Amino acid sequence: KNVKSKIGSTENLKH
């Protein structure tokens, strides 16, 4: 739920 979320990919932002 709060785990295995797409946001981690967000963490790399554009760079």
Q: Please state how this structure was obtained.
A: NMR
End-to-end CA distance of the chain: 26
Q: Count of CB atoms within 10 A of residue 8's CB?
A: 9
Q: How far apart are CA 13 and CA 15, in angstroms?
A: 5
Rg of the chain, C-alpha, whole Å: 8
Q: How far apart are CA 3 and CA 14, in angstroms?
A: 22
Give the count of alpha carbons within 13 A of 11, CB side only: 5
Question: Mapping DSSP to helix (H, G, I), strand (E, B) and coil, where does residue 9 land?
Answer: helix
CB burial class (10 A; 0-12, 13-18, 19+) of residue 2? exposed
Q: How far apart are CA 13 and CA 7, in angstroms?
A: 10
User: Per this entry, what is the length of the chain?
Assistant: 15
